[PDB]
Design a protein around this ligand. Structure first.
Ligand SMILES: OC[C@H]1O[C@@H](O)[C@@H](O)[C@@H](O)[C@@H]1O
Ligand SMILES: OC[C@H]1O[C@@H](O)[C@@H](O)[C@@H](O)[C@@H]1O
Ligand SMILES: OC[C@H]1O[C@@H](O)[C@@H](O)[C@@H](O)[C@@H]1O
Ligand SMILES: OC[C@H]1O[C@@H](O)[C@@H](O)[C@@H](O)[C@@H]1O
Ligand SMILES: OC[C@H]1O[C@@H](O)[C@H](O)[C@@H](O)[C@@H]1O
Ligand SMILES: OC[C@H]1O[C@@H](O)[C@H](O)[C@@H](O)[C@@H]1O
Ligand SMILES: OC[C@H]1O[C@@H](O)[C@H](O)[C@@H](O)[C@@H]1O
Ligand SMILES: OC[C@H]1O[C@@H](O)[C@H](O)[C@@H](O)[C@@H]1O
Lengths: 389, 389, 389, 389
């Protein structure tokens, strides 16, 4: 029948998309390798999420539930597989979480047949997004995410005013999730992330205090807060670890991405930085390192951005954005960086622990001015010209 | 496992290839419409024909039986479906027959899981090829094909001299085939085709007498022979119906393609014509019509070729060749022409009975010289310029 | 109406094709510059040559007269315009001549609305082809071409054996052509070309004696023959000017292309050379020069080919062929070379008289062996490495 | 200056071409992996082979010595590098030998600055081609090649009749070559190849007896001949090891490619097979194995071709041809197969010894008929369908 043939073709096209082999992009900077294809797009969502496959109830075979975007994904190595904890945004503009797995980390990602069922905390949330997974030493996998609600305290007609809180959930199988109380804090929070080890016997959070829903205001950067009880999480003291700076890629806002990777040289961090331009907000990725002895102490601040939008990455629902809240480091040192472009699709970039540490340690620090940048550059040129002669 | 993933990808890629929607080529001549993709290539043969899918016996997952070409296919409308009787040539250089079926005639052709099992006649054949299917009024589907054997008259070292006979088989299901005796005749034959109706109460064959295996010699063109008994087929009287002519597209050789289509205006024929050039033999398609009252009598001879190699068609194992031995005319008058290019792949072109008859009746006849061609052309130009003013 | 819209689209698409700007190919050898697009293809023939545009007599709007190829064109600068004398081959396999003109020499060639009407000589010809135009000092434009007829000596069934004579016609407007008697000669001739000046007060022809229709046999190369009376042309004395040589690009056959260009350094010639290979005959272009004092005396023989098939040129009705019988040299020294590829389409390449003479004079002569080729090459390498150090 | 800029651009473009990274073709058959780009083309020859770079003597900066093709290359692993012994054909139609080297075997091949200087034997040769390199246990690198001369028996006008002898040269550095006497034998020979080990204390050659220059006539296949003294080489006893067969890919001609690779399972051979078709001669590659105990004894004959022209490979000066006379097997079992397409360019395909042996041992043998091919195929289908259920 024509209908059954159409269903068969939908499924066949979907399998071909899912199984497509990724290929590295040859041209790169020696730090990271980009890949030709995204690891996930809205088109990667299962056919059976979007279409009613029953001819009786969907004789035209049209989509019943449109899928808009697959973005800002957490990540974890799980039972030998490479997992993303994907933020999937429907055509209805709500996001939900969904696990996708790959045998190799760069292609053949496939969504688990059901997305994540996440219980509400005591106050219901309208949207949930951007989960960071932490396999904590306490034996749980934590997902720290943004729980967003309308702010009724707004002028009449204002349906955009919102509040962001840090949601906390944990699981041991990524299917059954326990929702803990939202983080209690004196400011709005987004980009909260759980450090994987106890520090002074306490849970440690990366935080990002902000005066408003979109603007940080007095919020000084990426914060650090020790928490006595993750099941009744409340910030007491909050210390800024990585600061915003005028005329850097992290001027207006910044935030921790995934939880950092432990290296012999220190904690290796991946974050985003924001500045304003004539086209709106521009988001890039950057890195920093902190001490093993004192994870609050910066020990490497390579100047500028680590990755910024290239090519197809530049365009999407929210253009001029890269964002990451997930990466995986294998035992052999290979690193898989899962980053979204333009709030629309997920990509992978690969590197190694040794290369990322080399990048952090030997990319000169920002001296904060054009004159300083020129002096750093002239010094390198002088070395190279001597060598090339 | 890596092996199972590899098998799953082979199957998935194959399904995507098989299900690809064909699209008509916009640029055309108003007679036939070409399509963007071939209907069959060697890559269309089933994965399970080529690969041993068992890891125990094929751990590297390599092809065990290479497929080289899918060409010169017969065709029949069968139980609501569009069928080709494909000549499939293996990497071993032997050909065999195999049914492929489509729901619509222009794409989604898929081979039946097993190819054709064709019993030998009394004298075994080395190769069999180019089967024309005829649904005869006697209730059988006949396949008339070429059965080729090494020429025993050949001297030491000559492993190329061959003989061609017309093989005859029949079936009622395209799975169980009865092999009848090879056609008895005084010359070599290839391109023998069964006319679908009795004529004077006898079976009627299109023939192509030839003095040698490749060259026709004294062979004058496409012949017509009435046969009393198809189960003991022997040519007696033989008349040339469509002749070779110097400096036409059918100078050196010609041959009937599929059996002709019955129209109210006469029998509509599709044939091939051959000439020599610096690059070897060049094969094109051409049409002609014969009378319903007397199928041996020509009533339309449009000048020149009907189709010749265009673009991708020009290149293959045997370049500069189009060949057809199959077409299907639906009750609504739509015609699906199945033609091979360069002995390598199968294509489809579509037309209608009305357009093909129009083409045959109103394409001026060849006057056989440059001066005559110019006079025909000047006449048309004069009419058009008068109209365009 | 749908019909009128269809006609309007045919005309519009044709105009867009005709007006397309050509672009030079950047990669070249410094001798000639190729161009991205052919100057003519079969699709360039007028819409009103191919279609009957009257809905009453062609309601399906299909082509009534197919055009197959535009090839082997003569060329002349004429009343400020760049003209080709095109060999146009119909789908009927007959060729006829047709003028096409361009304002600039590299694109926007358009056929004159009517093709050439060429009267027959006393014995009618089946095909005419490959006309070389010569603006002779006697005030006439001569076209010397091949007039082909079926060989009456041929046995039953032989519809391929043919004879080639040199046809001679002249005109003062390229519209009204006077057919003079075919050249009288003791062998078959093709590639006969009129030298533009009297020599010893006589007409001078380039000739190409050949024992057969396709193969030259004892024919030694490109010949030279003085003719008292072009209106009763008969060869008496005949001298070979440029010879075939074993293991060169002109081993099996050769022939003069267009008439040579007069330069201060001598007559600049363009010719074709043929050898056999596993795929058939391979045709390339080559150049040579002869003395102004004695046009029968070679003064430059650059080794090897001048042009050979590249890319798209390699494929067509008769693949692996370049052929030229037309070029134009402007007063400023710019040269437009019109060459066919694969008997299918017409191309242009540009150079200058200075560059072509440079090429002829300073491309080393063929020493006729691998050892000699290596010695020439090692000498150049040695010079370059010395320079590059 | 404009001239110096032009030279700098020629050199820069050439370096970019030479350094281009090759990429494997994903679609394959599991036996061999093809690559996206040729390893060598005529454009890969050095700029300083083709252009005179001195403005004084070449002010137009045009090529002085055209290069036409890089084909049929021998191969050897040499001092840690991957070397081809390239047949380079000039625009003058003569070939010469030239070493090209790569660090990795699949790209970045670069010609040595000077080509090979090969001394003549007592009788000079017009062309030399298709050298097979053998690192013999006697400590020398031998190159066995074809030395071609015009046939003196030829009649007037015949500049094509030629004779082929087996040329023998040796070297210890690929720069200084000693020319030994041409092989003495009772028939013409081409595709002669030196086996790398003594057999019965004697040199062993693969041979290919042929009655004519192009056609083998009574020549039965690939031969084997023991030679006492390679410096006065003469064939005595000669045995056919791999035979031509009607209706196989090696019907008309065959010949050994490179010398075979030693494996624990036997000698692994790569050869070419030829048949005739309407377009001329068609050349494909095939494999076979012989015994370690007795290298004259066949132990594996996989049916059909190993590789045949695909895509771009199908077209060139001599289309419809693959040819190999070189491959390299690394100690780790990786195999680099260097094969020419269409006598025009050089390609690489990769495999492993294990895969190639698997292919030879488990691709079913040719049963020599359509019925046999169908039975082999039906058996595999039956196994697969049983597995797939
Ligand atoms: O950002 C868009 C433009 O912004 C303006 O301020 C200009 O000064 C430019 O520096 C810049 O191109
Ligand atoms: O090879 C070109 C053509 O040759 C003829 O003999 C036909 O029988 C076809 O089988 C083939 O397409
Ligand atoms: O077919 C290749 C060539 O053959 C020769 O005979 C020429 O006369 C040309 O007409 C043609 O281009
Ligand atoms: O031309 C096709 C092939 O012809 C054969 O003679 C071989 O010797 C090769 O030199 C060539 O590749
Ligand atoms: O910019 C703040 C937030 O605004 C919301 O509307 C979007 O859904 C988020 O993805 C975004 O992070
Ligand atoms: O040309 C005659 C025949 O020759 C055979 O070798 C080919 O297999 C056929 O396809 C072809 O029709
Ligand atoms: O090869 C000789 C001639 O043969 C004819 O059949 C072709 O029409 C000519 O174009 C060709 O030049
Ligand atoms: O076909 C036989 C030989 O003919 C020669 O003219 C070619 O140069 C060779 O490459 C070829 O192998």
């Amino acid at each position: 029948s024509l209908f059954n043939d159409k269903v068969a073709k939908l499924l066949a096209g979907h399998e071909a998309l899912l199984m497509r082999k990724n290929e590295p992009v040859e041209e790169g900077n020696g730090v990271i390798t980009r890949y030709r294809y995204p690891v996930l797009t809205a088109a990667h969502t299962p056919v059976f999420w979007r279409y009613d496959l029953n001819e009786e109830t969907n004789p035209f075979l049209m989509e019943r539930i449109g899928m808009n975007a697959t973005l800002n994904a957490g990540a974890i190595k799980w039972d030998g597989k490479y997992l993303m904890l994907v933020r999937v945004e429907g055509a209805d503009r709500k996001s939900f979480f969904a696990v996708a797995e790959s045998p190799n980390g760069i292609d053949n990602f496939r969504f688990w047949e059901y997305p994540v069922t996440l219980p509400e905390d005591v106050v219901p949330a309208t949207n949930v997004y951007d989960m960071r997974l932490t396999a904590h030493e306490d034996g749980w996998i934590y997902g720290i995410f943004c729980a967003e609600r309308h702010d009724d305290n707004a002028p009449i007609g204002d349906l955009s005013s919102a509040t962001a809180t840090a949601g906390i959930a944990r699981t041991k199988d990524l299917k059954n999730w326990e929702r803990l109380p939202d983080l209690k804090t004196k400011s709005q929070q987004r980009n909260v992330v759980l450090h994987p080890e106890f520090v002074d016997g306490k849970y440690a959070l990366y935080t990002r205090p902000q005066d408003g829903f979109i603007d940080t205001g007095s919020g000084g950067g990426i914060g650090w807060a020790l928490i006595d009880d993750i099941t009744h999480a409340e910030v007491g003291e909050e210390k800024i670890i990585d600061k915003r700076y005028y005329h850097t890629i992290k001027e207006v806002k910044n935030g921790e991405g995934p939880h950092p990777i432990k290296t012999p040289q220190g904690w290796l961090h991946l974050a985003h930085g924001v500045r304003n331009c004539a086209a709106g907000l521009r988001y890039v990725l950057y890195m920093y390192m902190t001490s093993l002895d004192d994870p609050t102490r910066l020990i490497a601040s390579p100047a500028g951005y680590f990755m910024a939008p290239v090519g197809e990455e530049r365009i999407g629902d929210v253009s001029n954005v890269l964002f990451s809240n997930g990466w995986i480091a294998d035992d052999d040192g290979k690193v898989f960086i899962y980053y979204a472009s333009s709030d629309t699709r997920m990509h992978v970039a690969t590197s190694t622990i040794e290369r990322l540490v080399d990048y952090c340690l030997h990319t000169p620090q920002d001296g904060f001015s054009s004159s300083a940048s020129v002096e750093i550059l002239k010094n390198l040129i002088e070395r190279n010209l001597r060598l090339m002669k």
